[model samples]
Target: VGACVLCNSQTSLRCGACIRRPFLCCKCCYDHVISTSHKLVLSVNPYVCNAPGCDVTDVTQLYLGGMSYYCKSHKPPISFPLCANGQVFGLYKNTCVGSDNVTDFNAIATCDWTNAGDYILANTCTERLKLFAAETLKATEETFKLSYGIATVREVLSDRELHLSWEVGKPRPPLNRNYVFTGYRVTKNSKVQIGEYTFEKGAVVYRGTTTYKLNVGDYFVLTSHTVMPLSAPTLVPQEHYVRITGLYPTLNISDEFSSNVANYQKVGMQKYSTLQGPPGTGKSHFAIGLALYYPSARIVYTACSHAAVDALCEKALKYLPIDKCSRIIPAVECFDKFKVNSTLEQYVFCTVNALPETTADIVVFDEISMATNYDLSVVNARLRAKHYVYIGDPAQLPAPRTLLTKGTLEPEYFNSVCRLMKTIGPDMFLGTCRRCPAEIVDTVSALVYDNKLKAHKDKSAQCFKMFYKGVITHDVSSAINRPQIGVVREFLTRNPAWRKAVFISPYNSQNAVASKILGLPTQTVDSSQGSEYDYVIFTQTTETAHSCNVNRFNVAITRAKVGILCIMSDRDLYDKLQFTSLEIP
Candidate 1:
């Protein structure tokens, strides 16, 4: 027995070239060098040939004629077909003779002629041998080398293109390596090949999706093929997609409000249009109605936040037939009754999940102001929609300033949206304020839009304001305003049903402070843009008095549906209203 070189275990197994140790244990030998090019031989007493004219010797014991022997070299060579020089071969015991006899000259030898010759040690011949070996191995394994998974298929309606996605595993090459994939479409008769293409890998919108332009057809199957060169790689894989057949899905616009939008001159013809509305005038409802008007046209409704997407989808479901609801799809994966049509004639996707390759006849972007110039540019470049509609309150907060400014110059300085707005100003305005109280609505219109808004009487609206003494820093004021918040809490305590109320602050940190004080959730106007509450408490900070602009103030005031409470410090209110200190108290 001997200790293993690797694990220092006592064993007899050994490598002929491992001079550091006498021997290695069987486990250690396999664990340390199984995948490496190192060779291992059984450790035993040396054997030498004693036959005349033979001087060959081996360090390990040998066997002959199905039985243990001292010298294998002395046995006659089994004559058969000649093994080409340098041909690789494997030697194994002819165990059929008997299991008990360890070894004998009944040895079997085989060469991979269908495989390849040994390396010639010359560069050219060596390279050829390597290729030959790979080809033979692939040929042997090809029967069991099944294709990878087919992730999904997408259809770009406008350009009549099809995009294919793979299941994220092999035959994908290593990362940063590129591959070329070819696509084929089966004929309509389902018998012959109709279209073929070399699909561009990364040029498509999202990662792992391949796009190929094809003729408009109702039914066809997509098949992708790439010959992975064992000799050469840089190729594609194999998969199949059932052709999207049947008439293009269509919609029926029944609502007069929605039908009227369709009637608007060239709502369908203009390349772009803007739909501007104040809070709660049914902008979401109107957008939903508008899309339903043109059923045949591929439509995409996108929003900045998931909350908005969910709300939009919920409203759309109300209008669609329960059976036909399969037409509305949420991007990416979800468990819903809609069959998860991530790509279809119509889709509702949050901005985070939407891709540029998503094509549509009409692209409806909600909360446009929340989208940065770079974001809008990408959307414009990728969406090949015929008619674009920008929806949101521009008077509300614009995109986050931090995201807008990449450097000294904003990337979106002259984005497509700027050109779009230049051509299509706010043509549609919904002015019936259903969200805010009558007094609040009147104040917002007068203060925010310069009184250009026509107010509709909504008696349910109410408003209130309270000012407390003392001026403090922005951080200090949040702590000092606890008493003022207590006042609002008392009011809610009396009117307990307004538990859905939320405190509004300009800064997220201050909002957090206020949320802890008031024992209620708080939000920045930007994050709460698409949502509404029965009551809102405006948590005023000294910083807001210095920097509050029309856009931010407008969104803060309009979020409350039933009433609003203004919680302010004495100085902020005095400075804001330009009133005497004693009068504010």
Candidate 2:
């Protein structure tokens, strides 16, 4: 409530003089009015002109009156079709340069010129400007061709340059750029050797060709000289390609007899029954019986290991027609006998990459517990069917992880079948051993199932003992035991019936080391889960500490249909050994 003069005389009004700024004044403003002859009047509110000279207050202007609306002195630049220069527009950067860049009359207008650089007006219009538009523009891509397809090598060849005449697909494009072609030689084992060379579209060829050392089964070819686009076109999903081999093989089912008839009937009838038993209990034989029982149903047989899958395929071929049996990852040796297709097909499959159609009636997953959640998820997705059979020993080897590398219990749906069998009664158990002798079966059952090592009458020529008895490191022990495997070799050679014998080892290094020593096939317990041999030699190595799993111990001992010979170090014999000499159960 003060005046413009600040004399404190009830100053409540604003006033102004000519060529003077506005100010607040009081009621008694006659003193300065007399000396200056200034007119004293009450200030009245009025709108100013919308010009720069009006000095008007604009409360609604954004950014000091520039963005939306501007006075005459600050109007924004007009839009024009001038070609932008300097940093230029888009990828058309270098096109607008020199005398050839001149075009029709054009003006450049830049808004907010002061904030950005003043380089906008750099390229000024001159008499040198002329109409210079591109009349024609074209692109010709280079192409190549090889007359020979998958050339052959008559003599043994090596360290030689590739020579191929690539005729011009078309007259070279006007660019006249030297055509750079790439060549590759692909070997049967899938090794690719590469080479490159520059060639004219039409010229005498082959002498200037690039060279690469190639194998006898190698295939060579040339590619186009043009640069390929950054990304390839997307492809649509393809149908599952299953291999079809004539008709199912004919088998003599009359010879098939089930001594355990009651168990066989239950196994064949139940949709989700789990056959849990120790090895040599004819679980595999019963699983095959169930498959044969359902003659009309399309069967899918799978296992965790390639070897196991192959073993199942072989067994299936024995009881069913070869064409009826299918395997994922078939054994190389048995391919000729089964006439197995190497690719996926409708009736038969050899790979797990694709799933069979939901039309399948029966799916048998052997070594069911070895399947990971991921394995089951992928495989189970294709299991939309009527009947499913799971054949495995729950007490045998289990998977290391649920998926590939995480700890989790086996899927409930998978383990539930096994659990349900145990909960039902002892009738679900398969107690008889069809492969091992009575003495061997009794000894293994007592040691593993009952947790008691039993003494038994030794069978001559049935078992062999070899031991390293010193302060032997892993290396020294392997070397010392190498020669002792001769006894095993001699025994196996003498008994040709045991030619399919498999050496069992807890460690892969020991298996490989032992296999080379004894000249026999070897596999770990997990790898040998669904497989059995007439003879399995158990080699206990001190190379690494054997993390004792009674289940693995059981699988190792049970794999031998006839007998098991343990090759162990003195340290392993006492420390790492799971079997101990004691009274019979």
Query: Top model by TM-score, which number?
Result: 1
- Those runs of model 1 whose alpha carbons end farther than 4 Å from true positions after fitting are 1-259, 262-264, 321-337, 347-353, 356-358, 403-424, 457-461, 469-480, 486-500, 545-547, 569-585
Which residue ranges in model 2 land beyond 4 Å of their true spot?
Answer: 1-255, 264-271, 323-353, 400-427, 450-503, 512-522, 526-536, 543-547, 568-585
Best by lDDT: 1
Steric clashes per prediction: 9, 14
Query: What digit string (tens of lDDT, one per residue) describes model 2 on residues 1-585?
Result: 332322323333323331122222322222222223333222233112234554522311211122233333443464211112121111222322222221221111111112111111211222111000000000011112333233323333223333333234332211011223344555566655455443221221222244544334443343433321111101111122132121132243434644445554454454444666667666667666655554555666665555556666666667777665544442223234554442232234333324443545556667765543334434555555444556676567664421112222222312333334344522345666666644555555664545322323243235444553323234312322343355556656666666667887765545555666666798767667656687777655443333245566667766765556666554433333333332111
Task: Give the Å error, residue 101, model 1.
Answer: 93
Model 1 lDDT at residue 401: 29
lDDT of 2 at 183: 41
TM-score to native of every candidate shown = 0.49, 0.45
